Amino acid sequence: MPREIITLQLGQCGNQIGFEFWKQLCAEHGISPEGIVEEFATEGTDRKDVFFYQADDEHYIPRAVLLDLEPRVIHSILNSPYAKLYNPENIYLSEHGGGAGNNWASGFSQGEKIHEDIFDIIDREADGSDSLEGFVLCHSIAGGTGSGLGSYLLERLNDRYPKKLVQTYSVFPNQDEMSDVVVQPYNSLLTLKRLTQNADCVVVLDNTALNRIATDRLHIQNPSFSQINQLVSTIMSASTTTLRYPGYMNNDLIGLIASLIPTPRLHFLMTGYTPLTTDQSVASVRKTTVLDVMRRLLQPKNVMVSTGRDRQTNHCYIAILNIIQGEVDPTQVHKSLQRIRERKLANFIPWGPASIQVALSRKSPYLPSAHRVSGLMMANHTSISSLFESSCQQYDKLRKREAFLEQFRKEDIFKENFDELDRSREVVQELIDEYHAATRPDYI
Amino acid sequence: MPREIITLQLGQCGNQIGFEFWKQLCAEHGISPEGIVEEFATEGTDRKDVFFYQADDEHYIPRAVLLDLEPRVIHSILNSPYAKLYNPENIYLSEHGGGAGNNWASGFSQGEKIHEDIFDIIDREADGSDSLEGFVLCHSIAGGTGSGLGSYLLERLNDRYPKKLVQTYSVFPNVVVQPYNSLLTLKRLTQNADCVVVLDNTALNRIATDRLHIQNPSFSQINQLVSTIMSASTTTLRYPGYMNNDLIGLIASLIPTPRLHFLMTGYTPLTTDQSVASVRKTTVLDVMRRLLQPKNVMVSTGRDRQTNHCYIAILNIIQGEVDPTQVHKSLQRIRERKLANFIPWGPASIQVALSRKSPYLPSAHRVSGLMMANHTSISSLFESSCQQYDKLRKREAFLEQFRKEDIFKENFDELDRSREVVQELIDEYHAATRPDYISWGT
Amino acid sequence: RKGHMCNARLLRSMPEFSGVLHHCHILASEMVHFIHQMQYYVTFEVLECSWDELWNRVQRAQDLDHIIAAHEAFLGTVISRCLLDSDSRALLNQLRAVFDQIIELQNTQDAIYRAALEELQRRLQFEEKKKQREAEGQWGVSAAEEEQEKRRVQEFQESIPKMCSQLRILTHFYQGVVQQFLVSLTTSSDESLRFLSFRLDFNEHYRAREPRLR
């Protein structure tokens, strides 16, 4: 049965992630930007019902609701080639293009104020999807709508669909880079709290890591927010390749969440891409072994998560899932598991179930893969506890020094005090402590 | 024997809709703009005398009367390419160029002034009709001619043709006396029409804009959508089938109670021909699921969360290549999924009839679905009409204009009793959604 | 159905012609609204499908024997929705009991309309003599005519109860008495008959009363 996902885009970064993911899904399923299925995808093996909702025009339309309080991202999404690919009725655009002002409290207020409109789009997508599994919230942890509206959207999806998985593509702020929002620390903390409480699983997409990985591994000088959104789209297309092309294992989001999240609360996932190189980096007659792919993904130059290289937090993978796109030999997958276990190519959490699965699945036929073996890494590592600690410390620095506290206290969430930011930092700290415990034998 | 239908068009919008419907019927039976049946539709199995009066010059003369108290609309209707197609003896234009003036009272006064003329046209259409099922009056409850003339025509038709079905096509406005007129037209439909089909302009425009992608809809597109829905509902009468070839059966199916005559309409696919359904066979099940979606209804009936709107009865006439087995599967799946919520005054009435679209009228969908459903959600639209009428009557808004006319000359009592009738209809429709409508009259 | 909605107004001027009109209207409305879905169900069980089945069966005949079965298959397709088998004669007789009840309600509505017209004739038949006598210069009310009119009005008010009770039984029965046939219809093994059981609708006394309908 198809399992549609309601892609909720909040903030500029979230709208870019959602639009790029929709474009990547249309390309991989062979759906043209007008939604009219591309001529090469009529016989496509893509489970278009599974990934995209079939509109009245039969356009392969992902159940995507783009809700942003700033009109710039909404206009760019509506101006993308894929405008007719997705259903227009699920895109709610706030005429007040003022945004949340990089304040998570203001973002949550905006999400709740557009809760009727956004919850309407979410429920419309659920009714328009045969077996809508849950909602995927692409937003920015440092933005106001992305962090705040991301929290509001995650909470709204959890309340309307408590039995539906709430996955978040939360753009974590640069903990090593001075955020332009002094209240961006509070916004990041609130987005992390939303990920921990109103979201079932949070994929932290640290823009500092995006720039670092693009510059060092992909040789992309200064990755832009557009570049981060494009990378997110490529990673999403890699993760949904097995969604469009039906495989034998990990056929649903709930199954992937179970295989990657031994702790129901500690579902915050760090990201990595393997091989991490520019498309111009043609692996010269290099038969990428499954073990070689595992080593390259485990290489920090290939991880797309800005996890502070904190020697205090013993980063270890709670669960490791290697999503391989292309022609991958299943026997080579078993050999890769053996070689990675022997060479310790991946460090696992000491207090989580050992999950090293080698599953062979096909990519979307409409999505051409330049590398015979492409790799997307979703790993639950305690280094995310380092990134969460950096975010929490930044949030504490903003709350304690009243950095952008005028903007934070201007919203009802922090009207009395920076309670929303403080509870957010507390939730982030608790998650970081639990993740460090998970890498430690004492988590259980 | 042919089973004709007498169509009375009141007001400018009604006359335009009548001209469009006559052209649609002509295209369905393959009748040219002069009414002459096309060579490809001469040997049709359609009973064209059922929809249009058959002129001996091989012209399908629609048994329609185009009535407009303003010469502009009447002249445009008689200047249309269907001027020779429509019989001129059935078209009456009020020489009194004052019109009904968007007042139900003035419309009723004008209708009383031309009561003999309308009854004469109805009788002439019956004479030109073989086995006429009844008369359908198309008018706007907020317009002057539509509301007042609808009431006058309904009273005259109830007096002259009680054994013929009384179909009313209420075209809701998208006039300060518009609320009193709405009450008056609601009273007229509830008192002299055996079945009233609500065509709300707000929801019709919303559906047209959502599917046809038309911004700021004009009356023409709403009239075209109404004509398409009517042709899909009349495909059984136009093409002599095996069952439901008469409007009486549909009226009994949707309004077994004459008072709960509020029939809502649905069209599938509700998308422009430009809206390209990519290799999507609009199956009976797909069309049913789209109709189960309230977004495809072209009637602005209040979706009250407090009132559990439910379909008292639903009959889907699928015109085109629609499989009867797929239709039965779609009906069963809609009943099981409760895509249509039904009243306790009668169990889940969801009927699926596989019908053929007229061969001379091109049908882009292999299986399309037109729904004539009596649902309690229309009771919210009745509540809205009653509220508008009360808003005008309580302050007598444009009650002065009706006071110039007989219906409100003494006071705004015609609009007040009319709004009372609309409220009573809303309450009755809610009872029809309730289990007690069987014993409500008991 | 149209008469139950219309002919009540033939003599909808006497309270004696109220219970009969309303109750018989309830009966007719329930039966017709229930049969509205049954019309399409019959139009598709063996009507819409059997013709195409016959066309397909004849579509492969390439011999006299090959064409022999082409029409026999259409015969079976059409005959399937008639329950004409002696074993199926239980459900067939139940359905014919439904048809008999529809015929009986037709006769009841005919009686109701006769009461609405013949009994409405007395209210105006006697007005001719008085109308002419007024012009002729006569005065007073004829005792024989007044007493005859009083007897006719009393008959129209008291014997209308026979119509009222018959129509009340009809109002109850159109959705209730259908249960003897519906016992078999509720056990619809055929998916088409199960669809009829899923849309055994618009009764006003079957879903509320008959357990299978609600």
Q: Could you tell me if B251 and B387 are in contact, meaning their C-beta atoms sit under 8 angstroms apart?
A: no
Report whether B368 contacts B320 (CB < 8 A).
yes
Residue C199 Cα distances to B147, B283, B330, C27, C33, angstroms: 37, 20, 12, 18, 11
> CA nearest A209: which of A298, A297, A308?
A308
CB pairs under 8 A between B and C: 161
Q: Are B413 and B439 within 8 A, CB to CB?
A: no
Q: Which residues contact B331 (CB under 8 A, 6 or more apart)?
A: B288, B316, B350, B351, B352, C40, C195, C198, C199
Pairing between strand B311-319 and B195-200? Answer: unpaired
CB A107 within 8 A of CB A150: yes
The resolution in Å comes to 6.8
Determine, for residues C40 and B332 on separate chains, whether the beta-carbon distance falls below 8 Å: no
Comparing CA positions, the residue from B377, B12, B382, B380 lying closest to residue B183 is B382
A34 Cα to chain B: minimum distance (Å): 10
Phi-psi region of B30 (alpha: psi -120 to 50; beta: other; left: phi over 0): left
Which residues on B lie below 8 Å from A56 (Cβ)? 211, 269-271, 275, 277, 290
> Cα separation of B121 and B146, whole Å?
17
Residue A144, classified by CB atoms within 10 Å of its CB into exposed (0-12), middle (13-18) or buried (19+), is buried
Residue B136 to residue A374: CA distance in whole angstroms: 67
Total residues found in chain B within this entry: 442
> Whole-angstrom Cα distance, residue B97 to residue B68?
9
DSSP A146: I
Asked if omega into B269 is within 30° of 0 (cis), the reply is yes
Shortest CA distance from A85: residue in chain B: B278
Q: Which of A384, A379, A378 is nearest to A431 (CA)?
A: A384
Distance CA A433, CA B2 (A): 84
Containing C138, the helix (H) or strand (E) segment is none
Is B353 part of the contact surface with chain C (CB cutoff 8 Å)?
yes
Chain mean position to CA B243: 21
For tokens 């018959």, the residue is C166
C204 in Cβ contact with C29 (< 8 Å): yes
Q: Which residues in chain B are contacts of A127 at CB distance < 8 A? A: 293
Find out whether C176 and B314 touch, Cβ atoms under 8 Å.
no
Q: Please say whether the beta carbons of A421 and A395 come within 8 A.
A: yes
* CA atoms of C189 and C186, how far apart (whole Å): 9
Strand partners, B319: B355
The SS3 assignment for B198 reads strand
CA atoms within a 13 Å half-sphere pointing along the CA-CB vector of C31? 30
Q: How far apart are CA A91 and CA A118, in angstroms?
A: 8
Q: Among A140, A138, A225, A142, which Cα is nearest to A183's?
A: A142
Q: Cβ(A391)–Cβ(A208) under 8 Å? A: no
**Cβ within 8 Å of residue A19, ≥6 positions away:** A9, A66, A76, A77, A80, A82, A229
Using alpha carbons, list the distances in angstroms from residue B176 to A2, B129, B187, B400, B409: 52, 40, 18, 10, 16
Any chain C CB within 8 A of the CB of B325? yes
Q: Are chains A and B touching, using the cut-off of 8 Å on CB pairs and a minimum of 3 such pairs?
A: yes
Which of A36, A42, A127 lies nearest to residue B276, judging by beta carbons?
A36
State whether B278 and A58 contact (CB < 8 Å): yes
Give the tokens for residue A229: 């959104």
Instruction: State the alpha helices, DSSP H only, in chain C.
Output: 2-6, 16-42, 48-58, 64-80, 89-125, 127-136, 143-158, 160-176, 179-186, 191-198
Residue bearing tokens 């179970």: A258
Distances (CA, A) of A264 to A309, A315, C36: 25, 19, 54
| Gyration radius of chain C over CA positions | 26
Q: Do C96 and C141 touch, CB atoms closer than 8 A? A: no
Distance from B277 to chain A by nearest Cα, in Å?
A: 4
Q: What is chain A's alpha carbon radius of gyration, rounded to the nearest angstrom?
A: 20
Distance CA A342, CA C102 (A): 84
Amino acid at A351: W
Which has the closest alpha carbon to A121: A93, A150, A163? Answer: A93
Nearest to B224 by CA among B198, B254, B189, B199: B199
Residue of B nearest to C38 (CA): B351
The answer to whether residues A361 and A250 touch, using CB atoms and an 8 Å cutoff, is yes
User: Shortest CA distance to A293 belongs to which of A256, A329, A322?
Assistant: A322
Which position has the token pair 């609204």? C33
DSSP secondary structure, C145-170, as one string: HHHHHHHHHHHHHHSHHHHHHHHHHH
| Distances in whole angstroms, Cα of residue B357 to Cα of each of B4, B46, B233, B318, B368 | 18, 10, 10, 8, 9
Interchain touch C–A (≥3 Cβ pairs closer than 8 Å)? no
In whole angstroms, what is the distance from residue B170 CA to residue A349 CA? 70
- Cβ within 8 Å, pair C30-B438: yes
Query: Count of alpha carbons within 13 Å of B402, Cβ hemisphere only?
Result: 37
Query: B143 by DSSP, 3-state: which?
Result: coil
Closest by alpha carbon to A274, among A369, A167, A353, A373? A373
Closest Cα in chain B, distance from residue C59 (Å): 18
Give, as one character, the DSSP assignment of residue B114: T
Task: Quote the crossing angle between the two packed helices B104-113 and B150-160, to the nearest 10°.
Answer: 40
Residues of chain A with Cβ-Cβ distance to B278 below 8 Å are 35-37, 57-59
B194 interaction partners in chain C (CB closer than 8 Å) = 2, 5-6
Assess contact for C119 and C156: CB atoms under 8 A: yes
**Bridge partner list, B311:** B342, B375
Main-chain dihedrals φ then ψ at residue A67, nearest 5 degrees: -125, 115
Residue C121 carries which side chain, given as an amino acid letter?
Q
Structure tokens at A73: 């991202």
The closest of A197, A111, A95, A198 to A146, measured between CA atoms, is A111
Spatial CB neighbours of B312, under 8 Å, sequence gap ≥ 6? B254, B260, B342, B343, B345, B346, B349, B373, B374, B375, B376, B432, B433, C202
User: Which of B278, B279, B295, B338 is the mutation pick for testing A, counting most A CBs within 10 A?
Assistant: B278
How far apart are the CA of B220 and the nearest CA of chain C, in angstroms? Answer: 33
Answer whether B278 sits within 8 Å of A37, measured CB to CB.
yes
Query: B–C contact (≥3 CB pairs within 8 Å)?
Result: yes
Gap between the Cα atoms of B286 and B292, Å rounded: 10
